[PDB]
Design a protein around this ligand. Sequence first.
Ligand code: HEM
Ligand code: HEM
Lengths: 719, 723
Amino acid sequence: NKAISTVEPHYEDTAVEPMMPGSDKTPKNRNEKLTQLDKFRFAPQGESLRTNQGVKISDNQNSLKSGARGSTLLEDFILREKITHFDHERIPERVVHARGTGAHGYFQVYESLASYTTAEFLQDPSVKTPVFVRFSTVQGSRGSADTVRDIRGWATKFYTKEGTFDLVGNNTPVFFIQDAIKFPDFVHAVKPEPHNEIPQGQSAHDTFWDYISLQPETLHNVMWVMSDRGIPRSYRMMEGFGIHTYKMINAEGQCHFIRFHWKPVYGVSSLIWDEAQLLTGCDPDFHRRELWESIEAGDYPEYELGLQIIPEEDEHKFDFDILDPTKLIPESLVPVHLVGKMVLNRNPDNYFSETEQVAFCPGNIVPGIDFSDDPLLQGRLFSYIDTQISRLGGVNFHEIPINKPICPFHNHQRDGMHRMSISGTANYEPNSINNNWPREAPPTEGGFTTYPQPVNGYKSRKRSSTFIDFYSQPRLFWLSQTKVEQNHIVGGFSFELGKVVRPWIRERVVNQLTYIDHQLAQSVADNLGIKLSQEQLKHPLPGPINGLSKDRSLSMYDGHHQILKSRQVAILAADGVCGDAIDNIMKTLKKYGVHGKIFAPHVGRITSLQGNEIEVNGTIEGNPSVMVDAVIIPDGEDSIDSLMKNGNAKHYVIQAFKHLKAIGLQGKAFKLYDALPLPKPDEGIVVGDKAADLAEAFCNVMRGHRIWSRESVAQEIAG
Amino acid sequence: NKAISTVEPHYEDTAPAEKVEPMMPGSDKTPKNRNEKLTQLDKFRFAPQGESLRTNQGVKISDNQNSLKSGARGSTLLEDFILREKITHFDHERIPERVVHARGTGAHGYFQVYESLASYTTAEFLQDPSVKTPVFVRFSTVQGSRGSADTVRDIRGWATKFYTKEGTFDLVGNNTPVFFIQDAIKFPDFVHAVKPEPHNEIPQGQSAHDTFWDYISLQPETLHNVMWVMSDRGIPRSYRMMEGFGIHTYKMINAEGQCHFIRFHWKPVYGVSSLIWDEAQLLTGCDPDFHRRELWESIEAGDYPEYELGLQIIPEEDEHKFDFDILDPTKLIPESLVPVHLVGKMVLNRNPDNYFSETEQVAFCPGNIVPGIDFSDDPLLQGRLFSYIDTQISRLGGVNFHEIPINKPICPFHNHQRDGMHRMSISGTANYEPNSINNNWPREAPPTEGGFTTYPQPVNGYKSRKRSSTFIDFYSQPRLFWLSQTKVEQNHIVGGFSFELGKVVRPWIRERVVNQLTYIDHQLAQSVADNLGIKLSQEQLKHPLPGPINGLSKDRSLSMYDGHHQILKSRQVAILAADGVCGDAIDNIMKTLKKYGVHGKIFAPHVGRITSLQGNEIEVNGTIEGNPSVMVDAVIIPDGEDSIDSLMKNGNAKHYVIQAFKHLKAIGLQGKAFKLYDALPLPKPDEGIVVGDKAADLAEAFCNVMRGHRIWSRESVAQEIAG
Ligand code: HEM
Ligand code: HEM
């Protein structure tokens, strides 16, 4: 009878916390754009199930048939409307950066930048400019994994009063190529190979390293993506760069050359390769989930907008072209002025309507900002609008709610697929029938104008001679890395080239490396079983850049802060754990803003030896050590005994050790470590009997992020 | 200057001069594997060797390295049509993925019927054993998007396009014999439930989240196919080693107008083998392309996927003789009630040349039948017929997707249809029927000349939306499936439920599923409840269980490892060696493997060549680090003190043994290699550890242990081993 009811219409009620739409979890975090989005929101509470035409549906369980056992009838418009909508849900994925995550927030300028730019959103510190941000990888398709080795895209849409401005950047300060014409060649090389569509989310295949090996301009960004910069811990914990030199124009008409920066408040932190690859296996949504949950936790992403500012007359005073996108501007030469702050504080309600459908383009500038002659950027300007025509179904993608400005947008454009606006005035300028409204705006009233840069030359296809420097900045970046960071670079090249089948591609890439640093090349060559010629070993090395050989800011662990707040600690516990230990650990974790997650052999609640019940965050098996920053094991005779019978929980300790993470062991918990095939405790194995003490010591060890000194012995560990 | 030369036009050779092959397009590696369809596709292929780089309009390009600017350091000019054309095309490369089964792989092949099936159907491709019917097969997962990983826990799709001489026939099936839902109107609800959740689009390629199990707990019809996917059927070893089913009862119509109810089956010649969960999950991390790569390499290796088409045949008069409705797609027809008759053999022997052109753009639909086959009143099947053509209008850019080469039939196809986006064919005759201006050609075909006709099945009822009372049996077949599993398989089913429900945040959803399990089997529920911290009540443990199905309480065919073969040939073995390995041991191992058709892969601490203790060099297949134990069926460690010495200082090499032990795989150690094993935290060598001093002797014992697929007796000890 009740079994029968499940296949009959459902007219009755059917009804620690889960991830929810932003409106449910953070309705108090608001901005002008979110308020505009409210018109498009739906509340089905108390509402009837209906067709798209508003007809109430009586039976959402059955097709209309000729009898209860009959043939389905063509006249069932409810079924056919429902299936038809489902059949056409998918729209094309982005050609690059298909895999991504979005969030709403706001931006505030610290003080007016009127000296350098007229841009409205950089004028008034009391203004909160809404933003939408999409973070992404680059190579993989929509379903690929978050923690791959890749460049990360970083697109910010600023909804200003004078127009929508898009800052479309990456998490490294250079790009792989100099001229936009090479973009389809580069992408095709890195993308899955065209016969078999293998491999997904990896540059570790023949066609990528083939292209690198024939295009030395790529080596600089290659050095960045082979470093640990290629596997960030979190979108909250990486830097951001617009890469291109833009222009800033002030009210006098003065032009400064500009480069954009995002500097994260939560520090710059990365995974290690072994850990990252494991994580694509156990949580392919790790970065998306982490960002969603950090917003729900209150650990809101925060980044400072910075600018490198170069007066126009200084354009030619560097050992590199500032118009060359494979070159960075060292912060030792030109420092980054932090001019504003961006806070991400609201998750979307519907991923598809907002994150999937958002459209960003570098050509979406506003008055006060202008383009430079960087030949990569000039090609990008054409591409973003053109691509949206098929991705979002036509030329009205700006009417999709996430893409609408919050300022007015009157013009004489009309029609196109899915036109929402209804115009009733003259569709041509100049007209007199409507007295020529809307009207052109004079530059002094905010009408956009291009800065009158001089143009002198001949029409030609030619790479500028000032662009032909491929190895100096790669060498500078290499020399600025710490020695652990240098080894991970070597491990990156060696693991990736190890998956290239054609040996001559491997040898050709190593040969390129000999023009950057000889021991870099030697170390990769050794790993690949390649004998370097002596001619190769003495290949000439580039000189210093404006008297510079290292730049501290290019190193993650030596040049940037590591933040304790918002990190995650696994607490391994079973029934019989000491309840007061757990309380003291949690209270300490919280004091520093760290999140303790109780992982146990079963979900639900575990019972402490004191008899109190403790709510579990997930199973050990379901939440491996790669998902947390550190591991702590509280005391309790029955718990420890249960964990020593558990292969996963023992493995949890071995793996966290191999991944250089902090491990805290209370009392009898040390027994567990001692029973394992692990060396004796080091600076990262915190052992204590007092829970509070142990936790404070454990938190201090976490501040260092990883126990780098353990790395040599870690390679001998069977885990 | 060579550096400048890389940013200027490339007018000279780039290939290295003449001083383990890579995967290649099938035309490159297997051009002698041919069929009528590949020959048809040959017209659309292109050889660029010696050809100039050109625009799509045919204009030679002089400088593919630079945009046209005002000076070498100037602004890019709008008049650069070469740039704009190249960027335009790239900007528009992507088309929508399939709304389900977006992650898939395809291969070309051919089908051959064993004996004429004329006594059951007129379908031309089942008439003549002499004919080789070309096929294209696309395997897939279901839930995930295009970039999702191969070895997830999911149902696998299996669609086969038969290019028959009287029409293209699509058999569109899955790797389990039932589906989750009874009526197609539920399909968007079910799919929305299993797909990533709409606020955050989490999770990818997993049913382990709240909305899926929310739906399951409220729709008990889903429980049969959920048992299948929670079992190890949901994580197959290889597309070459799973079964396939059309699921629906179809009809077959002979020349005499007789109708027989049928169910399609695919039986793999390489047997039915599955991964285990911990392995499958590790595999998605270290190779998301595992099945795609495996299939492609199996064809290049000549281990052609081979499958026998099977038919369950039920006479019209027998329709109502079963304790289930044969029109119910949550019901299987037990093979001990109705046997499966093998009637033909399909072999896949050529990989595509271009994945996008062939595999991505292929369109399959269950509405694409041929004369001799008809539909039944299965209400899931009926709804599917509308959906496949409709979806393809937007996915493939319009209603001429049948003109895309991979979709074209190999027979004639004249009709009065015209126009539509990207019309390739040029018509010059009357576009209506009847016409006299071209004498009514093309013309309708009489049924006795092969014109399609629907078999006149009686139709009697009332227009209504109602679930048939004969469909309301949700627990008998899940119980049947459960009781037919061995204890090992039963345990893995419990682990699948427990792992998945462990990731369900809302606890009432976990408890409602466990409650549903008490109506299937009380020990099933209890074990899952224990793993979820759920205390079952006395009333729950005395919930009534259903009775046997036409006298059956167990069916041997429903068990993967008790009712199906394991095949040694095409399996992969890791051979772990470093510098100083006993070269003759590797040689005698390799030849013993080649003897049984097993592939040995030498994995070392570095790619290139290792040198044996004898002094000779051995080309290696890749690094231990880059090729962990989840990627192979078994592991063997040859002798050589220097090689063993190196491996025992290699953390990955030691973990290789530990992991392969925990994943119940066969391990062969020769001479001092056992010293590596003793140093690890592993017990008394069991039946699945082979130890011998002489290499050829050891390999023979090794291969013979490999025949059991996995060492199930080791499962209890394996849980305590440190990962
Ligand atoms: C400095 C170099 C570049 C950077 C930093 C960059 C950055 C990005 C980012 C972050 C996205 C993803 C935006 C999103 O979330 O929706 C993106 C998309 C894209 N970019 Fe680039 N890009 C660069 C160069 C290029 C070039 C040279 C081209 C080709 C001319 C190109 C074409 C595209 C296209 C077509 C998309 C997809 C846009 C869409 O579908 O919405 N970009 N780029
Ligand atoms: C017996 C149950 C079903 C099975 C075995 C099944 C099987 C499949 C398979 C294997 C594919 C992938 C084909 C490919 O490789 O391209 C597929 C795709 C699809 N199925 Fe199903 N399906 C079933 C039920 C349904 C239902 C009930 C619907 C909707 C009413 C549906 C709609 C679709 C759609 C729209 C596609 C995408 C086709 C395309 O994009 O070309 N299926 N099905």
